Design a protein around this ligand. Sequence first.
Ligand SMILES: Nc1ncnc2c1ncn2[C@@H]1O[C@H](COP(=O)(O)OP(=O)(O)O)[C@@H](O)[C@H]1O
Ligand SMILES: Nc1ncnc2c1ncn2[C@@H]1O[C@H](COP(=O)(O)OP(=O)(O)O)[C@@H](O)[C@H]1O
Ligand SMILES: Nc1ncnc2c1ncn2[C@@H]1O[C@H](COP(=O)(O)OP(=O)(O)O)[C@@H](O)[C@H]1O
Lengths: 475, 731
Amino acid sequence: NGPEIMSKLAGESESNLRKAFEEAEKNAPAIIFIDELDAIAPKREKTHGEVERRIVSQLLTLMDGLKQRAHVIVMAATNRPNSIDPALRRFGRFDREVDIGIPDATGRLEILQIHTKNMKLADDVDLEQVANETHGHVGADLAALCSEAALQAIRKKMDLIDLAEVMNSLAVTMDDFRWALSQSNPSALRETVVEVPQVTWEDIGGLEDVKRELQELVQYPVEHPDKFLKFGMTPSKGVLFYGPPGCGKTLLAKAIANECQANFISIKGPELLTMWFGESEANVREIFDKARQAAPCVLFFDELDSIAKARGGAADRVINQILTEMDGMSTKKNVFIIGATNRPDIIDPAILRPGRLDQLIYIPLPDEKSRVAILKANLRKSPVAKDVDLEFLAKMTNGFSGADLTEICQRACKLAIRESIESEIRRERERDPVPEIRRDHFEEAMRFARRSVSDNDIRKYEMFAQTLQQSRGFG
Amino acid sequence: KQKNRPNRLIVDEAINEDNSVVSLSQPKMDELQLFRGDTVLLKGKKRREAVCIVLSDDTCSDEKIRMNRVVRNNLRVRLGDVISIQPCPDVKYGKRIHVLPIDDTVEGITGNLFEVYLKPYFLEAYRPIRKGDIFLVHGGMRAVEFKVVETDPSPYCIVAPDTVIHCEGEPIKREDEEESLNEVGYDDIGGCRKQLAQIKEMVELPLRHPALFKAIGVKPPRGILLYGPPGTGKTLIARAVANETGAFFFLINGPEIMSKLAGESESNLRKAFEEAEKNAPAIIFIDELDAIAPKREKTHGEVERRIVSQLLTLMDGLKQRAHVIVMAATNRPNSIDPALRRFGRFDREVDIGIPDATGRLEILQIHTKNMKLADDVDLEQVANETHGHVGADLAALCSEAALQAIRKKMDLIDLAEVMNSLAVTMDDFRWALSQSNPSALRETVVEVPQVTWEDIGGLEDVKRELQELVQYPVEHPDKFLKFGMTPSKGVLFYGPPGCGKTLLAKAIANECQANFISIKGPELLTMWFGESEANVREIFDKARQAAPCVLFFDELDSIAKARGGGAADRVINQILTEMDGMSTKKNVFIIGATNRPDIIDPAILRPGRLDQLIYIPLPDEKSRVAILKANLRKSPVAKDVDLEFLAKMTNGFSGADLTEICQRACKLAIRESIESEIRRERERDPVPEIRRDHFEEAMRFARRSVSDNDIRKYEMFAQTLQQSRGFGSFR
Ligand SMILES: Nc1ncnc2c1ncn2[C@@H]1O[C@H](COP(=O)(O)OP(=O)(O)O)[C@@H](O)[C@H]1O
Ligand SMILES: Nc1ncnc2c1ncn2[C@@H]1O[C@H](COP(=O)(O)OP(=O)(O)O)[C@@H](O)[C@H]1O
Ligand SMILES: Nc1ncnc2c1ncn2[C@@H]1O[C@H](COP(=O)(O)OP(=O)(O)O)[C@@H](O)[C@H]1O
């Protein structure tokens, strides 16, 4: 370990660092691991002192001391790539760079069976929906969650005479898992997830032409590499998305990466504003290089007009590095940039030039088949029964926002929660839950939904569409 | 708690003069399985022991055990306390005994004390002794105390006639601090129970249960941070878990490590943890962890990086060996080096915080256990106005009150006259509160306020959705395991100048029995202008630690007026980034207050982040009665006017304006009482009953603080809030 070398006195830092390297002279098949090397070799100008430079210099000297003699392998534990100084991680000398990241729902699931294959669960928990949630959780925290579950298994037993009545048969419940999760905290929070999410593409209906160029864009650069090379031109680097602020949070680019089995990294809107306001224009290189290293991922940028709204009181700091690293990027690596912006008038003029971002795909307001698909997605992954209908909404929902329709469904579902509370009151003054909503349970929810889009914004969307509408010739 | 042992009895006075003879009742000796001359083990405080012989006593109570003050001083107990008596069938006779007399009991007498005191006391008596105990042997019309130093049967022994007694001349010093508990009382520390129970569980279940570690898989605690304000009793917390399980405490000061020279600074830690490692029950307390381990940019020096690295190595060297854990005090966890806060290495992190009102009440009770009161104080409203204080400040308060009680006495003959009984009164505590410098001030705290929903009425359907949006998700989550999806993360209040919104928000957390935090608007402006927007993340972290809790925000139009005349600020996007990482679970409810909802950054109105918007109108004419019923306290009157005369004609006035009317009537009433009593002093029972005229000049000497052109903007928001509803379905 690195702090073993750091803990010794001056002059003894040479000891217990080279000593493993002539110990590796004995063993021809051998590896060398240094734990927590960020404390060993940080930025040289960041350190105040000289012994740190001595340790860094002797480690760099003993890196190539075994120049393919014993064929040993050096691996290390780095918390961040920018913690390591760039002189040590130069190419040819300690430069093979892979990553770990955070596990997905299946990874958290496998962590759960690994940590529960030794202990005895009470074989009633699902252990899968638990791993589907706990977003931003290290598997060490999953081990701590299992330890807290066993602690609750001790705790629900009263103060006994210390005999194996509960010790021989450890009883754990799903409510125990949830309450141990409640008395816990994530440490992998506010980090960019590199795993692919799934919505399985059925939840979005309509916009079939938009689906046609979305299957044109990212489905076959690696699925049809030679067929795309029949003409020889490069794939389209960037696509810009514009339309009304409705049904426009996420999951479309996640779906279109999910047919390609590609990773997903989303860039948040206020994350860009925080990096702009905090004068931190160096971490954009880190997240862009992480996105390039997570290939074949497709990027997603949200609310670029918010930076333009901040400039409104066209180019600024965060636009400059985005343009620089987007132009300074190969046409390979299967990397696509998707920009979400509901205000196309205030955007940067160098974005819309072709070669960088060219496909100005317009997303219209959700129509009748789109809202039928939205109610079907609300039926998806949610408990529901029959007598529900959608033909009332043929003129009730003429044109609605998708977020408006989801909060309609959520408010009606919480009205069903309120009538379940009334069923609890029924059980209270007795001394049926009826989870399915009423036939006209949406009737008061009709007064809980305003069309937040104004008609002049639809007019300016039509004007920007007809500005980019092109010529028609015949005869 | 445990019914496995009937050992818990009551300490009572004894009849027999023998120090090695204790008394018990006849029916309770057969339950404890004791013989005629059985030797038992008595356990008192500071895990000390004393071995005596139980004899049957007819007048002894069944629930009580009789002992004299020699046994009582050895067990470090008093009258009315509880001890445990254990039968010991493995007691053997003594081989060698080394004792040393105490210095103050041998002054004036010289010579061989073996043949005068030690020989008739230990001949044909079979008295069992304990190493470290104090026994008194009379002789020569004086009282000479004796203390056991070294025995060849090192745990305990019975003084055989063949036992050689080593009694060479060396006078030992009597320590007055050894008698009082140091500090073994579970109830000695107070005001922390909601987390004291948690930390007592996480240090209790690793102890006493070594075989439970194979069932637990991995032990959850290895190193526990104790962060909070200074003076809250972290040393007393560390001494509280000390000696309650029979584990070695071994307090280690951070300055005591930093004070020594290099090499010696490298020493006294691995020596310290190996001295912990030789014993199986072992705790280590560290004070001033940040003095040992500050931030990396704070480290300008060779030695400190070496000692942080050595602490890191010496912590992760132990891996499930001999169940040893460590606790450390901390100002605030941002100052600690973040490489320490890992998993398997400082994973369990607990907060203490300031004491509550009942907490400061019981802490005042604890610190006034040992001193005599005059029995005239209220002693609860003393603790009620101690806002922004700490337990060290409370100790300073009681010390200054006793100092003022000393100042009641003049310069007397300096003998024991008022030392027999003190006469500290309530105005002494008022004077101590007058010269009271707080420590927890300039720091926002968390507590559960006392409102209980009955101060303000109205909003009868806003309150119902307020319980089923906040309270009932906490109450029953099985309906959320039903058809129910995720609930709303938080709401925002907009309406009048929000003088009622804080009392409208605090009442839920009292009803929910949840915590509350109010981050005020000037603090948010200080976070913007002071370039301290990173600390909002730690504020949200302490909010998540205080789950369940209510996040109160206010005057978000104030931060938007500085840019409206860009849109977002350095703190608005940071707040959005913090609340976007908030889970749908954990019941972390947020609430915002805004006087001007038009000047709002529009990155909050979409659902998913924050969906529900709560409009409130002015308190109407029936709401005047609801506000005036809350004036039963803080301006008490019984019957002088009906409290509906002002509400019958006045069109619109704020409840802030109505309480301004009440406080100005209070001012007029107190003033006319003052010219009622100065004339009686001039001529030579307050009668604080007020009349209608104070209400008359209060209701005429007033001004409606709200503006009418903002109200029509609120019905502009309300006519926006009539929406695109349908008339009805056709089934
Ligand atoms: N399914 C989708 N996934 C991602 N972005 C979309 C989708 N539909 C539309 N968008 C883009 O998002 C923008 C509007 O997003 P918006 O609806 O404001 O987000 P939210 O759903 O969080 O309110 C539009 O400019 C549009 O181009
Ligand atoms: N809440 C409390 N209850 C009782 N005593 C307290 C409390 N807080 C502080 N004290 C007293 O203050 C003294 C100092 O405690 P503490 O602040 O933990 O030590 P340090 O200043 O070394 O951290 C203790 O001896 C304790 O008796
Ligand atoms: N329902 C109410 N409406 C208006 N003001 C009230 C109400 N109830 C109490 N108040 C008064 O408001 C004061 C507290 O105002 P506060 O909530 O701190 O304002 P702000 O939140 O704007 O700082 C109290 O002194 C109380 O007299």
